[PDB]
Amino acid sequence: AASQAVEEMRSRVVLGEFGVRNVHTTDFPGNYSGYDDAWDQDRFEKNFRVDVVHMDENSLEFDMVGIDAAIANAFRRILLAEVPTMAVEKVLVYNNTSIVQDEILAHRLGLIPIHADPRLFEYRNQGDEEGTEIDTLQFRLQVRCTRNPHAAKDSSDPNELYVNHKVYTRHMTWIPLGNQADLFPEGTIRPVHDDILIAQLRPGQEIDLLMHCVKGIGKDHAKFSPVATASYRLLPDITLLEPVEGEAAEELSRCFSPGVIEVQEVQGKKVARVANPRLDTFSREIFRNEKLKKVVRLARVRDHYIFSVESTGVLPPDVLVSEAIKVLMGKCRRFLDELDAVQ
Amino acid sequence: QGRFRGNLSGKRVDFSGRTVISPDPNLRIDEVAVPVHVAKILTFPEKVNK
Amino acid sequence: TEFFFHTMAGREGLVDTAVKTAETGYMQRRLVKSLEDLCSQYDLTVRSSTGDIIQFIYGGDGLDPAAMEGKDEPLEFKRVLDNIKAVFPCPSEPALSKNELILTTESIMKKSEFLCCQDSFLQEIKKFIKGVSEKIKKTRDKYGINDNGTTEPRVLYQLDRITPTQVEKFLETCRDKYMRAQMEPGSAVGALCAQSIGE
Amino acid sequence: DIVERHLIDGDVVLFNRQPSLHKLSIMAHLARVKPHRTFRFNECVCTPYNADFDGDEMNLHLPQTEEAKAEALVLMGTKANLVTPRNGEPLIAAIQDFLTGAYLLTLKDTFFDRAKACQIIASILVGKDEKIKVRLPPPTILKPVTLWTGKQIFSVILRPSDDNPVRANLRTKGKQYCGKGEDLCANDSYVTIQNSELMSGSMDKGTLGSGSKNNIFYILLRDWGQNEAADAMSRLARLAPVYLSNRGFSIGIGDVTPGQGLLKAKYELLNAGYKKCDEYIEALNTGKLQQQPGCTAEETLEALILKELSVIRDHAGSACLRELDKSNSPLTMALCGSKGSFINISQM
Amino acid sequence: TRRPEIGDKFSSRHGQKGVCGLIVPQEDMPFCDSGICPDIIMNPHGFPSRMTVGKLIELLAGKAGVLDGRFHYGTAFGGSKVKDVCEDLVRHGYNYLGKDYVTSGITGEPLEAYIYFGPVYYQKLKHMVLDKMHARARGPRAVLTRQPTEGRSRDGGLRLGEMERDCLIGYGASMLLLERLMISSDAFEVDVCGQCG
Amino acid sequence: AGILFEDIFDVKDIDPEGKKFDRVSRLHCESESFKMDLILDVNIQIYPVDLGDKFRLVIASTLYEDGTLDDGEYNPTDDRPSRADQFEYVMYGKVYRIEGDETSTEAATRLSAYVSYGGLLMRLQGDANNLHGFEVDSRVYLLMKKLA
Amino acid sequence: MIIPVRCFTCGKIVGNKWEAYLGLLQAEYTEGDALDALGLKRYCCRRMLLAHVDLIEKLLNYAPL
Amino acid sequence: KQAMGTIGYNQRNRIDTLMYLLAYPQKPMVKTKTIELIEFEKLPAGQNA
Amino acid sequence: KTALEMVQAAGTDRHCVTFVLHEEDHTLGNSLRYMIMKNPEVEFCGYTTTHPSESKINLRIQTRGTLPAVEPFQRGLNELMNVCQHVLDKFEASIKDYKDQKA
RNA sequence: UGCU
Ligand SMILES: Nc1nc2c(ncn2[C@@H]2O[C@H](COP(=O)(O)OP(=O)(O)OP(=O)(O)O)[C@@H](O)[C@H]2O)c(=O)[nH]1
Ligand SMILES: [Mg+2]
Ligand SMILES: [Zn+2]
Ligand SMILES: [Zn+2]
């Protein structure tokens, strides 16, 4: 009926065969007559909830119910760009005989993440290339490739012919400044993966350089981005308009993801049902079968967003989200203070 | 490339540049963007008045 | 074979366009070098550089091709009348009949500002006014509309509703457009013609 | 004294393309400084220059005299040269990615909520448009749900504020107009705008393009001056991209893949054409063939074969257009006239 | 070492040459359910008039290849068909037409139409805006005729050819044409005798 | 009361030219009291309709029954007793054309009002006595309520 | 020339997995199952690792040394 | 004919008046038999994005 | 200097106001837009970007009656801050109980 | 020789 249609338009996002409908957020006062969509902190806090479904090293997955697409995209973009981290900025070279270009080497080194905690540092002021102990970190890299004094007669493999022929990021040595050695314990300031291949050398070549890293946000450059892939997707909710049984059940199971549709024998006949719509990715392969088009109804929940954040290993994703929310709150407080000073 | 066609009818001038174009719908139809590098080179003689 | 034939057609078109570029460049150069001497004077006579007159009046009437609203015509009377009726709707004034419309048109056209206008444009205005008045007469004869203004259904007056204010606005707008669309003295009409024939 | 000042905002500057066909290939614009290294301008002015943004190098000149500056700004003004002297048709009008945007916006299926309507209306409130009222138009449907229509969102461009004296009026036909609806076409292809309010019809190249007369921008230019038309074009160029990006418009292999009925019709038509061609070849070789007037038998056979192939092509194109479903990007673009056509669609 | 910026030209191995129009951040670039953002966004309006179905076929084949860990062949008058790549996509769980559900990055709301994503082999051309940019001050002139030089390497100025002169004449900017062709190009003061001429 | 017209119509066809639009449909309806025909664009997504559906339709000058024509601006947030409370499908449009019938060459008495509800076309055709009060460039409210 | 450290589209650390992918190639693992075991779900990293050509050794063969 | 990419394995020792190289060149995913024959996959001149 | 106010015209009308915000992007713009749209005393609310080169945005707020359009702005900011604090606390509690039930 |  009309009430059911309005409820669907305001709650679910239907995906059609040719296009998606009901994609705009309309839950606002004045748009609906029979609904008082005015802002209510009580109802918001009552309906809002967060449930973590998977949390491991450099990977997090959590469902937020009650939040809106606007705030979801805000959090996503903040995590992507507006989270400050540490990354190599200045590169001082000393007689680099490597075949790799100096600029390409500096870019690769800048793309290397640093496991240092950014909350303990500050942004470098305009200029001041010398850097201060508070807002700078120094990493020395000195690799001299030479022939292996003891090797086989043929030694066709470079691993046996030469030594230190692949300059990995593990060769970086953090040089403390001032009281940083006492502040940070040994082993904390180090490359994240410790296995990134920077370049390859040959006997006679040498790479000697110093890297000064400072605090910076991802908006200025992508090297400061802590999150490798931080995104969110609406919760799928597949519903069957009419009970589908028989070989049509196996057809539905093959059309949808293998982990969303399950077939059961309740009375000796196979009948399909929705088991876990989380694993479904909406491949829209059911539209190929002519008969099975008018039996299902794909939909996305408007107030249920699964956030998946896979980071590079600088700091855990829970603390990343915490810092993103703190940065948003700081922006809000700064704007409030500016408005107060204006008035 | 003669004096009538190459040096009188069509001749080269200064205070001009040549650059590649790119789309930008955020500007009016009667407005054109000029880069800072070409702007610092192309100068205009303004007379000092009151 | 189909791909080869398509490539043949494509290369044919490419070479055709390549020849066309140079051919039209030469033609445009010649046309401009030939027509770069004419210009529109203040006495509405197109003359060359030596003073000889090429035309006593540009195009026979003296209108700007760039300001041509209709298909080789100065104005589109129907569109102008519709725009005037939509921009200035007078709900506090009654409608006009055929005789009243003709009378007000004849009284307004005989003013001084309309004397300097060309006779052809005035004749076209008269013809359009007569046509619209005949249309109004036919509509009123079909729907039994009385010119006295005492017909009970007032909606019948909304079929073809015209007021003296709208008539005057239409006439003034047409006159202003016809006066502003004339050839402005000093324009390189010869060069404009050369470019419009070359492109 | 004389000071050689740098090129700052507000200075008149000549912009030209080296290959010049008509006078509109060079125009005097106002220079604005930007940190990039390229000459940027409104894409609506690409038709005059005949540019395509595929590596074209254009020239930029700076006059060195106040009289020359004034003459360039007045005579060679972009707002004053919106029409060509050849036939008076407007060249500075909507272009690809704008005609399709306006069409999808004014489609009868568009129904925006208050938030989206306000966002689309604010997307243009920049520059000189920051000192004017928004004038949110009343909603069409309000009891079930308050929805603002794309046609009203577009008419907001014509009449952004209340104090704006622009009252646009137009009544014309579209490209896909049937010919008998008389403002009631099933496809809604009869453009009718009254008092700067889109009453009926959908925008396309016939109304927003630079094809011929009856353009909304042309009517604005001829009725309310050049500044109003320039502002309307700027508002359109600033609004259409935002809505197009927020809606999404893409093309895929499924938008051009054929259907089963289409393949069947194509096979039947090809069979019939080959049979008729073989019959004509046999009649010409062995026997007497009907010779058309003014040509020999070989030319008659050539003309008949060409006619049969053209009939096959037209029937295949009609079948493809009838089997293709709406919302298709190639079909929508060919309908709105932004780029492509039914001929290219049937060929591909 | 130069970075791609506004004005750099790029090709897509299909003659669809283009120029860098804008560089939008990653947060502004749209994102799909998996979180992949597009590196290049091309204009779909170029497909109808050019009939470049080969580009779509290449994109679909490349998507299938990167999904199944294979290298599809685009051999002329042959190669991998569309059905094979569609089967690969439907087996790997992606749409059989390339179009995937994508959410807008600016507004955070899903798009009404699906976006056509896929890996395309883009190649950069030597035409650089940094090299094609030119701005000529007074600079030097030629000995024979006191006018700016021709080439950019020799610091040459632009040429107001016969077509430009014709356009200026048609416009009627007499003072502009004079300042261009006489004052700012080859201005000079000579001495003429009124007796012999 | 600002009721300009009111009548019960019955739908005779949904899409004579096919399913052109997904959300909007061109319904053709005929009145029972008089010979009033209505060609109206309706939104079926938010207000579904069928072929054999009958509905009362009222075209009024204002939305308030008290007669207050103060319609300078509409505030959906304001709650007050109005005419929309007695109906289900409310639209706001403007009567943009009034055209007489051209089929009858003589003794014609049929007119037709074309209204544009934000693009949605509504042609109400019939005897002129029923269209009393309709004027060009006049904004009005349409109220449709289905019956049993 | 050399495997990039970051991926163009997303930015996941992929330079550290180049030697692992080479080892998987020397082993009996195919491209598909090797990229699957390396932990690359999204196709961007799969493409980054598969379409990459190893020319650093070809250049070092010409290096002065 | 103007595409940017690697020239050969001796491009570092080669000294020409003008050379354009790519940082991270990648071989195409959809490669042709002609590509395999000419060995262009070994010296690609573009990247897959 | 970060956030500046502008009236609709020289008349200094407080019903319609424009807030120009520097060093910002679509994130805070859309967040504040969504948080202030639910205010029943707002007729129109819309954020836009001047040019992608410069980092600044322009929000425009037109109220219903005689609201200065600055109190709705402050209300939206406070509501956004409260929502941020609430979601932060909820996420912290969620992570804490998740670690507790995992260990 | 390339570019539009
Ligand atoms: N890069 C470049 N090479 C040229 C150019 N002109 C000539 N060449 C070389 O010369 C050949 C053709 O040039 P021509 O047009 O015969 O030289 P030309 O006829 O003297 O040309 P003009 O100097 O204009 O008369 C080409 O096939 C090139 O080998 C040029 O302008 N640029
Ligand atoms: Mg070009
Ligand atoms: Zn003498
Ligand atoms: Zn990746």
Side-chain angles (χ1 to χ4, degrees), chain D residues 17 56:
Chain D
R17 190 156 180 270
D56 301 4

PDB file of all heavy atoms in Angstrom, chain D residues 17 56, chain J residues 3-4:
ATOM      1  N   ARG D  17      42.401  30.696 -31.163  1.00  0.00           N
ATOM      2  CA  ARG D  17      42.922  29.441 -31.683  1.00  0.00           C
ATOM      3  C   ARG D  17      43.582  29.709 -33.028  1.00  0.00           C
ATOM      4  O   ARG D  17      43.005  30.389 -33.883  1.00  0.00           O
ATOM      5  CB  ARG D  17      41.807  28.400 -31.832  1.00  0.00           C
ATOM      6  CG  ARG D  17      42.301  26.997 -32.145  1.00  0.00           C
ATOM      7  CD  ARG D  17      41.294  25.944 -31.710  1.00  0.00           C
ATOM      8  NE  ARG D  17      41.752  24.588 -32.001  1.00  0.00           N
ATOM      9  CZ  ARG D  17      41.509  23.933 -33.134  1.00  0.00           C
ATOM     10  NH1 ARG D  17      40.808  24.499 -34.107  1.00  0.00           N
ATOM     11  NH2 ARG D  17      41.972  22.701 -33.294  1.00  0.00           N
ATOM     12  N   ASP D  56      45.097  20.767 -27.841  1.00  0.00           N
ATOM     13  CA  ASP D  56      45.122  21.981 -28.641  1.00  0.00           C
ATOM     14  C   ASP D  56      45.890  23.084 -27.919  1.00  0.00           C
ATOM     15  O   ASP D  56      45.664  23.347 -26.733  1.00  0.00           O
ATOM     16  CB  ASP D  56      43.698  22.451 -28.940  1.00  0.00           C
ATOM     17  CG  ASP D  56      42.885  21.410 -29.679  1.00  0.00           C
ATOM     18  OD1 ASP D  56      43.405  20.299 -29.902  1.00  0.00           O
ATOM     19  OD2 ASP D  56      41.722  21.702 -30.036  1.00  0.00           O
TER      20      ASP D  56
ATOM     21  P     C J   3      51.547  13.716 -34.732  1.00  0.00           P
ATOM     22  OP1   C J   3      50.926  12.470 -34.216  1.00  0.00           O
ATOM     23  OP2   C J   3      51.412  14.062 -36.170  1.00  0.00           O
ATOM     24  O5'   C J   3      51.008  14.939 -33.865  1.00  0.00           O
ATOM     25  C5'   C J   3      51.056  14.910 -32.426  1.00  0.00           C
ATOM     26  C4'   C J   3      50.800  16.286 -31.874  1.00  0.00           C
ATOM     27  O4'   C J   3      51.805  17.240 -32.316  1.00  0.00           O
ATOM     28  C3'   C J   3      49.493  16.905 -32.323  1.00  0.00           C
ATOM     29  O3'   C J   3      48.539  16.167 -31.578  1.00  0.00           O
ATOM     30  C2'   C J   3      49.761  18.371 -32.033  1.00  0.00           C
ATOM     31  O2'   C J   3      49.727  18.688 -30.656  1.00  0.00           O
ATOM     32  C1'   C J   3      51.183  18.490 -32.582  1.00  0.00           C
ATOM     33  N1    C J   3      51.170  18.680 -34.037  1.00  0.00           N
ATOM     34  C2    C J   3      50.982  19.964 -34.551  1.00  0.00           C
ATOM     35  O2    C J   3      50.861  20.914 -33.762  1.00  0.00           O
ATOM     36  N3    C J   3      50.948  20.141 -35.892  1.00  0.00           N
ATOM     37  C4    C J   3      51.084  19.091 -36.705  1.00  0.00           C
ATOM     38  N4    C J   3      51.038  19.310 -38.020  1.00  0.00           N
ATOM     39  C5    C J   3      51.262  17.769 -36.207  1.00  0.00           C
ATOM     40  C6    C J   3      51.293  17.611 -34.878  1.00  0.00           C
ATOM     41  P     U J   4      47.264  15.548 -32.314  1.00  0.00           P
ATOM     42  OP1   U J   4      46.910  14.276 -31.634  1.00  0.00           O
ATOM     43  OP2   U J   4      47.524  15.556 -33.775  1.00  0.00           O
ATOM     44  O5'   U J   4      46.147  16.631 -31.985  1.00  0.00           O
ATOM     45  C5'   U J   4      46.455  17.651 -31.024  1.00  0.00           C
ATOM     46  C4'   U J   4      45.805  18.947 -31.402  1.00  0.00           C
ATOM     47  O4'   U J   4      46.715  19.916 -31.999  1.00  0.00           O
ATOM     48  C3'   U J   4      44.525  18.886 -32.224  1.00  0.00           C
ATOM     49  O3'   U J   4      43.416  18.802 -31.117  1.00  0.00           O
ATOM     50  C2'   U J   4      44.537  20.277 -32.928  1.00  0.00           C
ATOM     51  O2'   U J   4      43.510  21.239 -32.802  1.00  0.00           O
ATOM     52  C1'   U J   4      45.999  20.810 -32.835  1.00  0.00           C
ATOM     53  N1    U J   4      46.455  20.527 -34.244  1.00  0.00           N
ATOM     54  C2    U J   4      45.715  21.072 -35.291  1.00  0.00           C
ATOM     55  O2    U J   4      44.799  21.854 -35.109  1.00  0.00           O
ATOM     56  N3    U J   4      46.119  20.697 -36.563  1.00  0.00           N
ATOM     57  C4    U J   4      47.137  19.816 -36.910  1.00  0.00           C
ATOM     58  O4    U J   4      47.378  19.564 -38.135  1.00  0.00           O
ATOM     59  C5    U J   4      47.820  19.253 -35.773  1.00  0.00           C
ATOM     60  C6    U J   4      47.450  19.599 -34.513  1.00  0.00           C
TER      61        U J   4
END
